[PDB]
Symmetry: D2
Amino acid sequence: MELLQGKTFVVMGVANQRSIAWGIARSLHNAGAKLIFTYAGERLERNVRELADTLEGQESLVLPCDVTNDEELTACFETIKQEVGTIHGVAHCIAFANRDDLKGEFVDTSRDGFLLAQNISAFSLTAVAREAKKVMTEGGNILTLTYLGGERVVKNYNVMGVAKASLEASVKYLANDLGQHGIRVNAISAGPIRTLSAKGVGDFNSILREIEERAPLRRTTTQEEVGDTAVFLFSDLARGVTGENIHVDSGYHILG
Amino acid sequence: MELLQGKTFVVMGVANQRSIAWGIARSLHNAGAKLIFTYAGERLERNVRELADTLEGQESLVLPCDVTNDEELTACFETIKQEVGTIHGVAHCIAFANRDDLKGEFVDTSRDGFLLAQNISAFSLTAVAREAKKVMTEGGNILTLTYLGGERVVKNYNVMGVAKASLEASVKYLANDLGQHGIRVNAISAGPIRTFNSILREIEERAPLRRTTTQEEVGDTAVFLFSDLARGVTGENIHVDSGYHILG
Amino acid sequence: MELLQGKTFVVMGVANQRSIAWGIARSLHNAGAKLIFTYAGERLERNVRELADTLEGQESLVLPCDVTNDEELTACFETIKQEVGTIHGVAHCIAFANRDDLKGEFVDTSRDGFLLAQNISAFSLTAVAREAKKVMTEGGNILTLTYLGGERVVKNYNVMGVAKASLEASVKYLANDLGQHGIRVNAISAGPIRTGDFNSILREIEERAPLRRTTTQEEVGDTAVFLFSDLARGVTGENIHVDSGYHILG
Amino acid sequence: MELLQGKTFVVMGVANQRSIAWGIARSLHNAGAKLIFTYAGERLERNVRELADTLEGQESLVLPCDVTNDEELTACFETIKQEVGTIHGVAHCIAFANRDDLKGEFVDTSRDGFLLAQNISAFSLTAVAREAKKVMTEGGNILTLTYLGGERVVKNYNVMGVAKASLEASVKYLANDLGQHGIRVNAISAGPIRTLSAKGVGDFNSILREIEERAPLRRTTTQEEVGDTAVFLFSDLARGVTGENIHVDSGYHILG
C-alpha cells in the first residue's frame, strides 16, 4: 500500500462500479495513490462522485472531460495544473463504437461509424497525452487498455478491433515521442471479464466458458488482476518499461 | 506471361511514373492482365490517362473514384460492372496525411489530421472492398500496400504509421469477412524505393539483400497474390523490403 | 509453365505421395523445373525413386542425404556439383520428433528427445544451407516448411513447436547471412491437410478459417513456386502462411 | 519492502556480483523475499556463498546445480523439498554459447555448438520447470531472461538468437502445461546493460551509445530495472500474467 504513495493519477472512463476504470482506481488507491476522476457526461457526474466518495482519505477531485471536445479537454488539465500541480500518470479507459458495427460483417461498416470509433477509442489517447505532458513534470506513465481483437480477428469485434489496432500503434508512436520527456506509455490487453451475474445460456457466457476451458490459467480475467498490473506500470518498478502491451488474459494470447 | 491471362484488375493510386501503383500495373500487364485505372481530380486524371495510354493492347478504362466520396465510389464500380462485367481484384495504393503531421512529435497531431489520414489511408480499403465484392463474380484478391512503420516506429512516419496499423488490421477483418465469398485480402509491405538518401544508404548497408526495393519487385509480388498460385493465402502481409523487417 | 524454366531444385523430405514435399515437387515440375531428390535409409529410397519415376521429363537424380550426418551431407552436394554444376535452391521439408513427446505435457520432454528434434528439424536447415550455397552459383532461394505451432501454442505439438520456433529464427539469421551472396531464405507455414481427433481439428478449420476449407499440398506447392521464382527476388526472411487464413484468428 | 514477504525463490545463474541473476536477487531480497542460490561449477561455489552472505537477516541455502546434469538437478530440488519444502518461484538466468559461434556467419555454426547452446540456454528451462513443479505446491512464477535477438536478427548474436527463440517458445508451451497447476511462466527481454567501466571506443560501447541515442527512454537498461520487473512477475500483482515476454529495454523493441 506504499508502491504509489505520494503519487497522483488521473483516472478516465469511470461510468459505474462495474467500469474497468473503477477496478483500476480501487487498485491504485490501495497502493497509496491519490486519484483524480473525470466524467464524460454530466449524466455520469453523479456516479463518479459517489464512487469517488467511497474512498476514505482525502477528497478526490472530480472534473468534466469530454475527450471529443478539444476545449473541454484543455480546460480539464488546465484545472489540474491550477489546483493539483504535478500528476504522475493517466489511466485512459475510454472506448466506443456504434453497437450495430459490432454485428455483421466488418465490410459493411459505415464511414461515420469507423471515424467515430477511431476518434473516441484511438485518437483520444493522443489528445489526452498532449495535455498530460504539461502536468507530468516528474515523468511517469500513461496507461491505456486494449484487447486481443486489436492484434487478431475476434468474432463480432469488427470496427473496435481496427480502433484498438490504431490505439496500439499510437501507444508505440507516443512512447517514442514522450520517452525523452521522462514519460512512459503502455497498454494492458485484458482478457474478457465476467461482469454480469447470469450464467448458463448466452453468447458472452460461451466466450467465458471457452476461456476457462482453454486458457493456460484455466480461468477468466478479473478487474483486480488488471488493476494490479496497472499498479506495476504506474510504479517506479516499471521505470524501464515503455511501448509495451502486457497481456492480462490468463495466457489466452499465446494459443494457436 | 499468361499467369493473369484474361483477368481484369482495378489499380488505384497511380499518380506518376514513380508510383508503386504504376509498378504494379506494369507487372500485371506483363502477366497478361487487363487493367482499369482510377483517378481523383484533374491532375491525377491527366497523368493516369497518359500512363494508361502507354500500355500495349486495348485502351485501358480510366474512371473517377474519390474514395472519400461514397456516391462517386459506388458509381465507379457500377460503371465497371456495366462495362466489363467482372473483375478479379483490386490493387489499393491510396495513402495520404498532412505533410505538417509527418514532422513533429506524433503527440502534436491534430484531430482533423488524424481522422483525415484514417479516412483516406485506412477506411478506403473497406469502402472499396464493399463495392468491389459486387463485381468480383468469381472471387479473387484485394491487395493493399503498407510499410514497416505500421508495425514498428519509423522516424517521422507518425500519423501515417497509425493509419497503416489500422489498414493492416482492416486487412485481417476483411479477410475474415470475404473469404467465404472466395475473396482473399492481402498486404505488401514495401521498403523505401530510390526514385532520405541516408535512409536509403542505411538500407543498402544493413538489409539482408544489401539493396533497396524496386517498383518492379513489389509489382511481381502483386502478380503472385492476384494469381491462382496464391489461392491459399489470405490475411497475409508480405514484406518486399530486401529483408529489412527481420533486423533488430 | 515457364516460371522456373531451366532451373534445378533439390527437394528434401519426400516420404510418400501425401508428403508436402511431393506437392512442392509436382508444382516445381509443372513450372518447368528439374528436380533432385534426397532420401535417408532404405524405405525412403524406394518411395522417392518410385515417385520421381512418375515425373515425365528426364530421369530425376536421387541421392542419399542423411542430415544428421556431416560427411554424407557434404558428399551429397559434392555429387550434385559434379553432376549438374548449379542448382537454384533447396526445398527443406525435414521434421521429426519422438512420438511419445507429442502427447502429454511438454514439460516432460526428455533431454534426448528435445535435442533430437532440434537437430533434425531445426539445425538441419543450417547444415543444408552451408552446403547448398557452394552449388548455388547464381543465387536463388532456400525454402523451409513450418507450422503455426512454432509461433503460438498448438495442442500436443509440444517439442515440435519449440523446434519450429528454432527453425523460424534460423530462417531469419540465415537470410541475414546469405542475402549478400544473392541467396534468399524463406518459410511457408502450412495449415493442416486432409490426407480420429484429427478430423475435429480439420472440421474446426473448415468452419472458422477465413477461406472455410483446409489446405492442400498443391496450394503449398504453388506458393513454393513463387518463392523459388524471380517474382520473389525482393522477398527474404519471410514466413508466408498458406493456411486458409487461420493464422489471423484470435 | 513487503511485496514478496513470506515467499521463497530459487535463483539460478549467479557467477559474480556483476551477474544479472545477482541484480535480480538483490531486488527480490529488498521486496521481502527469501532466497536459495544454485551454483553451476564448484568454481563459482565460493562466489555465490560470499555473495549470499551480503544479504543479511536470513541464511541463504546454497546448492550445487548443473542443469546439464539430470541427476544433480533432480538431487538439487529434492534437497530444497527436504529442507525448505515449498518455494514460490524460480529465476532462470542461464545461457551459454561457444564464443566463436558469436562471430562470423551463422551459416558456419557447428552442429555441436548449436546443440550445446540449445541444451544449456533453452532446454534447461524445461528441465528446471519439471523439478520445480514438485515443490511449487501453492503455484507461483517461473521467470527466464531473453533478448531481442531471439525475435529479430542482432549482429553477431547468431546461435544465441536461435537458442533464445527456442527459449521463448518453451516459455509459451510451459505456460500452457503448467498454468493448470497454478504456475505461471514468463520471460523478461532485457536490453543491453553497461557492466564494464571502460567508455569511449569499443563495439559494445557503440551498441550502448546507439541505444542511448535512439531508444525511446534515451538510456540503457540497468540490472535494477530488470530486477524490479522480476519482483512484479513473482508477486501476486502479476497473477493474471503468463506466457508473456516483458521488454525491459527502454522501449528499444518498438523501433523500426
